[PDB]
A paper describes a structure:
The V/A ATPase from the thermophilic eubacterium Thermus thermophilus (Tth) is one of the best characterized rotary ATPases. The a-subunit is connected to the A3B3 stator in the V1 domain by two peripheral EG stalks which form a peripheral stator apparatus (A3B3E2G2a1). In addition, the dodecamer c ring composed of two transmembrane α-helices, the d-subunit and the DF shaft constitute the central rotor complex (D1F1d1c12), which rotates relative to the surrounding stator apparatus. The proton motive force generated by respiratory complexes drives proton translocation through a proton pathway made up of both the a-subunit and the c12 ring.
Author numbering:
A (entry chain D): 121 to 359
B (entry chain F): 5 to 463
C (entry chain G): 169 to 211
D (entry chain A): 1 to 577
E (entry chain C): 1 to 386
F (entry chain B): 194 to 386
The structure:
Amino acid sequence: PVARRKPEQFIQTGISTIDVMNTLVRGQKLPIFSGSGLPANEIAAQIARQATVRPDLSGEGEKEEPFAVVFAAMGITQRELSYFIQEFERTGALSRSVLFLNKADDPTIERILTPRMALTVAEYLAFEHDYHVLVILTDMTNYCEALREIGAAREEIPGRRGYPGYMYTDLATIYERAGVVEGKKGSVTQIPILSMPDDDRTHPIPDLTGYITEGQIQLSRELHRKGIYPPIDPLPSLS
Amino acid sequence: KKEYTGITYISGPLLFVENAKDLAYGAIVDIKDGTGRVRGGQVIEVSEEYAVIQVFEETTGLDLATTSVSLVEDVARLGVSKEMLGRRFNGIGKPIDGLPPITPEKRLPITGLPLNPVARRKPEQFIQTGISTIDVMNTLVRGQKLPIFSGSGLPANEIAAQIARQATVRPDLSGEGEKEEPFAVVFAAMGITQRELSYFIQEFERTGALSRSVLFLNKADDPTIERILTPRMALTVAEYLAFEHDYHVLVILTDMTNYCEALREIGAAREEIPGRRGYPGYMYTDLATIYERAGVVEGKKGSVTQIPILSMPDDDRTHPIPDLTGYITEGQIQLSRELHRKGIYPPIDPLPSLSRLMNNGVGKGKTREDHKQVSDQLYSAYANGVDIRKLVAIIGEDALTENDRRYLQFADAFERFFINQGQQNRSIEESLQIAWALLSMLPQGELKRISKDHIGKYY
Amino acid sequence: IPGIRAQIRFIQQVLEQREREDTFRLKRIKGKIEAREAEEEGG
Amino acid sequence: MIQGVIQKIAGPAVIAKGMLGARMYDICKVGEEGLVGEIIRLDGDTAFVQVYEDTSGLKVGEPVVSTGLPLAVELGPGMLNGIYDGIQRPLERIREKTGIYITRGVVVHALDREKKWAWTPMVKPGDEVRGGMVLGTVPEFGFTHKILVPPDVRGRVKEVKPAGEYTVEEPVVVLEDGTELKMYHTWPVRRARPVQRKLDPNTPFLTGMRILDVLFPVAMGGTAAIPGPFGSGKTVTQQSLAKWSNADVVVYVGCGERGNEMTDVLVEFPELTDPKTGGPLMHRTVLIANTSNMPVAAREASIYVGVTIAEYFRDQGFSVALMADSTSRWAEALREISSRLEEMPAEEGYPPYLAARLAAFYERAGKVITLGGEEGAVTIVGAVSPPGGDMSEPVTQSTLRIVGAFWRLDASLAFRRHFPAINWNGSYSLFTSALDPWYRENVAEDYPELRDAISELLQREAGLQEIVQLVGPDALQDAERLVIEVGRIIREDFLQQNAYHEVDAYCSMKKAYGIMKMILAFYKEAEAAIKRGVSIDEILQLPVLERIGRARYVSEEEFPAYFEEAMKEIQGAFKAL
Amino acid sequence: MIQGVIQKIAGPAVIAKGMLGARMYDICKVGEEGLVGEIIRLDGDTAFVQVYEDTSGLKVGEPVVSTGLPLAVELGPGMLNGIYDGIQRPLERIREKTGIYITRGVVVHALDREKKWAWTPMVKPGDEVRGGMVLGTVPEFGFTHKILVPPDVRGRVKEVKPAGEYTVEEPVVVLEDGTELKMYHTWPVRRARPVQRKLDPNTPFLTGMRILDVLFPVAMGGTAAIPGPFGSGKTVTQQSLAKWSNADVVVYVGCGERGNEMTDVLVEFPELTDPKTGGPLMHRTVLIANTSNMPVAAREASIYVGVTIAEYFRDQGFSVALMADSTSRWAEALREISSRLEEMPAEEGYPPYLAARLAAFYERAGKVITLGGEEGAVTIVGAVSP
Amino acid sequence: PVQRKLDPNTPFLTGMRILDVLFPVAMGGTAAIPGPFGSGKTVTQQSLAKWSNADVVVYVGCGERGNEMTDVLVEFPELTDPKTGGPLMHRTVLIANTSNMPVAAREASIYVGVTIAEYFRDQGFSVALMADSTSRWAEALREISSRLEEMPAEEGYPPYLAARLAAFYERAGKVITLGGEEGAVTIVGAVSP
Ligand SMILES: Nc1ncnc2c1ncn2[C@@H]1O[C@H](COP(=O)(O)OP(=O)(O)O)[C@@H](O)[C@H]1O
Ligand SMILES: Nc1ncnc2c1ncn2[C@@H]1O[C@H](COP(=O)(O)OP(=O)(O)O)[C@@H](O)[C@H]1O
């Protein structure tokens, strides 16, 4: 705990609303609660490429610090797998990012380690060289869907509404990859975006998060039905 | 022939004896007492070194010093013969009436084997049964496995009996005689009340329909376990009467809720998994074999239409018994307390009665051409109906427009005139008449669901 | 409000009670697996 | 080969003993009868037999002999116009040898061995080839039924019998490799035959149900899901596709669906015409039906064979439409094994494998170029059934968030009377943007705008709905009750077809498209009606509303002009009053 | 007999070893001071006992003996009036020898042995009988009480004592088979008792209390429940159901209801007057009361005594009202027995064979024509509590 | 072991108007405070120690979404005693533990704080423990009871949560030392669901 340095910095995104009203600060975790069919992904990959921290406004030399977007989805369809790679390659920014993406069908085991990969890889960025990372994991619904199966076989008794007892812990550790640490200048951003099934805020998988991640930025039908994009409400949402 | 001893464990309706090694999974074996009374039981889990027998009766006083088990048949089969037609039999059946033993002209496997679907023939025939609801909206057909979802205080049995009494094909929308169809009945019980018995029996004695019909019995005070044999038995007397000897047979399996109850018992007393609500999860299959035998075979003659009546608790509709029946049978019709307070007899609602096989055998020289469009309109009106029963009771006592007034006015109507009915039977035509009479009250230009000709044709 | 509230709870407690038995039942299954294979150690 | 006997038989499963060297999942024969087995667990030398059919009448110490091939349907020309059991056994021949009973102890052949066929070759002998390179074209109905190299075979030809009738079994190709290609070729099921490579889709899978084509829709590589409680039309909305889809092959397969709904498509289906030939529509049809009543384990087999068939046809080059009718029972079936072999389960008792064998399934294909260089599509629209109504239940939910294009079929909708009404306030497709190219060109150049305005009312309409139930339609005034009613009609007439009305139960876009433009207009002019000074109140009770009413019923032929007549009738019938 | 000893003890369950050919379901005295149980499971040689007493303090090694006979009640005359409770011991005598507590394990006779009685034989030697015949009348209160021959017993008669003063023990009728057809006989609770036919109902059974009756009557035999939360009528509507009538005897078996909850039953009762013949009301009652804290399991026994007493009486022409109130209790019984005997429950813990026995408990009632060709009907009016 | 509980009847200052005048707690008192966050609840906790009425501050919660747990750490040294002008940290003792930290760490966490408080208490001072994230406290407990197969009960927090939770509070009030003096152990119960 001592090592960590309180956040104070800023990060732009390139999306508007999630910078104006409720602003992703630097060295910060934060998640986008999506609904069942509202389009998460797109609102993902925009905020993939777009961001660039402007240190400019604060005053200091520009290229003292560069930007790394570290990205990992999972349970992606042959379909999804292609929407990324198309967008990514488009204007290109693959040349400033790392991929990791565990197909849907792919074995359930590796799934479990999958994020932890792109997390730890993120460390090596900021602590041994200083960088400014943005880790964006995705669909942690899958993370547990998949999880359960493992635990269900390897033995244990599942606790409350399934979702094996040691979830709290296990989930916790996939979020302590963040914050700046005194002296060291680079750091990790988490935005993990996931979807609920019961379309609530009460089912555990999201609820749980909402105790350790620190805010909430929902997407409603309302916007989206009327056809806007990217629909991020106002008022439900607050960092 | 032979004879075992080697028991080790008795407890519940599950029996255990060793070194047996030459039975078969599904075998009626015996349980000769060390006193003189035989009982029968099933080989339902046979291992190398012990096995399960499944006592078909209560157990009392049995030992751990004598007792004999004895292979009766390898695979359960019962005889059949068109001989019987006025008999009674209990659970497994050992004829009860003081009259002679049976004579078989076949033995047949009790499981049967399900029908090859190619062997199915397209159902089609429409019958007249009386009680509007069915005969207009949902309409029974020779071969629809239909079940009448019932509650409890609702009269389950009574309503069944009419059907037993007025079911009859049309001979005139088809080209045959009436001396081509009388009917036949095969009743069964699975644990009923005694008072439900007699009520039943007398309505076979008063039509004098009692003969030409076999009715098996099992009151609810006999042994527990024999709940799981009996249904099938009767159904197997059904294939026999149906297929080689040509008949049309309406089979009543009234009450099934005791079925699964007994079923459950073996279930969990062994160790199989639950799978929603603690009914053993393989339920689906066992409840396939009962309803699924029926239908109408190809280029054949005969018919097996099953109406069994469920008695799910409360007026729930997710207690898993009627659940799975839902997929299993095609469609259903529900009785509901909903009506019953009002005194309208025999209650039914249209609102959750489907009846799948219906777009077959209707209107096309099979009923008046008005039928297709009748139903959905009249249907949909009522739907539309009760809906404003609510919106009314919130906003005011009315605040409705004079368009919408006409709707609510028909509410009370529909239920009251039409769905109410005396013992007084109806005909396909007189029904329809009435039917148009309730469409009459709404003013034209509100009935979009009917097309312009038909509407005016008989306005 | 205070009534339809009053329904909702009723759902909760029963939805929950459902699973207590779930576990308790499931528990016993484990007991079997281990007791059973303790004598597939043999000897 | 490898052989032992029954040790413990009890339930659909058995444990044989005296066995070793087995492999996971392997067909076998058990009992004197011989029945079709599967290896699903080993424990020293004892093996859990999984037994595909029934049981009863068995004794301990009877044959148990494996051959060691792990499942596979033997695929080749001539399969349409049939029906097939769970291990692809043609019930016709069965019926011909039994009577009217599905009886155990049956063996026949998958593809009949009698019929010979008109051959044609392509390559000349003394040539080179690699995996899945086309070889001979035997004709077959309105189709051209090619033959491929069975994947993962490569070499060089050495002879080729020329034209003429020839047997199915025949080796009609020889290689310099000592190898022999014969007409069919056997392929597993657990695997997943590759293709040249994976590719994006963009062609709409037409379907003619307006509700599945103006609102929610599907990509060609589409994957979707349809759920709804018992009595909800679950089956019938797959009926229509089976007789109004827009592709080469319907491969309707249902597991755990009753006879009655199957057989019917075997007596109606002969007398109808396809939208792609003129012939008996039954040519593009499979049916691997395996109704509830049959055995236990077959319910597991069944699906993965029709997945494979779905590849097999694609492979030749066509455009597979596979749809599994009622996959959920499959779960129940899988789990019935479980119980008896003692595997602790996850929630609602399903054995933890729900994902495991689900997720492989649904990912399967769409627009994928083949080894043959054809455009291959796998179109699956999975049916499922919950067992409650609580979509919260696992086996259901696991479908979402593994596939896109979700349609939900409301329950309380349907009790009234519509079909195939869905909640569009539940539903959501994803595929809907990458459809835009094709739509623009093919249909109309302004269509997607004109549709979004329909959803403009439609999804916004709830906005008022709620307030209706909070203080009646009373005291909702007039821009208010405008909308309510507009939309009232929008679902009363743009969202309810049939599957039994003699016509009007299939539409082209351009027709449907039409209907849809009208209503917009009616909204527009109405908006300007009230604003000008008159009222909807009478407008409802205009005769012209009902013309917009009945409207859908006329057929195509009339349709242009029908539509043109209202195009006059509008502008006059507003300004006047 | 057969001997054995203990294996484990668990709550009120007990297992035993050393049995062999113990029969299934019997009177099993175990415990040095005896306990009188019931055999559920028979495993191996190891007999699962049930015990209807607080098992406080047993060692390991006590005798286990059987009688090869199920639990059963002596039925005969000398019934009406008196307490008998669940395990059929008439508290009276217990009360009297042992102070103010239940000192578990005291053995006593049931139906008395010393009161004298006047007998009239109504049939002469060597003549015919079917089981279930009457042999003689006896003065029992304002009642033409009859001494019913036991079913499945028949034979000619060697002699028949003439009129005189006697106790019931005495064989009054020796059968021509050298079979001392004693007055009363033992017919195990489990099972019912055959009858010539069940005859439809049609005659009212009133109860007089208005609302309950005029609108929602019941038929003469029949059955109906009283569900209901706590804190409403249950405990005392039945009481008023009892104190007024429309039939003869009243065999009332509560179960686990408090001390006062059937105190009052007893003491007030001798003061009211029958509205059917006049006279003090004890003359048509059977007390099978049951302390709440009584041995947990003994409720299961208790209900079953009741119902079988009613049939016996029914076969003597009368109309018997039995309204054992509170089946929730009975529930609890099995709810525990399961847990011991280790069985995967079903829905809320009750064992699945609930409507197994339940069903029958409701069934046996009705209206019939017996062996004596006598009308008679046991009515049951169940109360339940969720 | 201590020698006499003594009745409460002793004020407790906090200086906050609203605190004592209306809702005192008494020294040796035991309170609890919920408070959704994003609403200024830490404010109090700061001021709490700032004036106090005791003289030994022990603050120790355990687990709390990362960054805010670090806030404690940082603002703590900046504040200074307003009773001597000595740096505040001087008469202080903090135990921290952050979400992620090992399971049975966290379970012990409170208990730690509780003991240590008693120690200091024993020396005759008057003490001031604070703890927060009691709501989260149960968490660990669930977890341990996950990995031990003991059925749950109630909503999902095992049963002991009417005892260990209990004992955490009992130990306090107006103890009299074996050293014959008086020592303050008020705990004020943050919770937060
Ligand atoms: N398109 C339709 N047109 C008319 N009736 C329909 C239509 N779709 C469904 N229905 C009616 O509602 C019923 C619902 O379909 P059903 O076969 O019960 O489906 P499932 O049981 O698979 O959910 C149909 O049988 C039919 O009577
Ligand atoms: N409905 C009634 N109105 C007034 N007092 C009643 C009524 N019914 C019962 N009581 C009183 O309430 C007491 C509670 O007992 P009772 O209602 O019989 O059963 P329980 O309290 O066991 O549910 C009765 O003893 C009687 O004094």
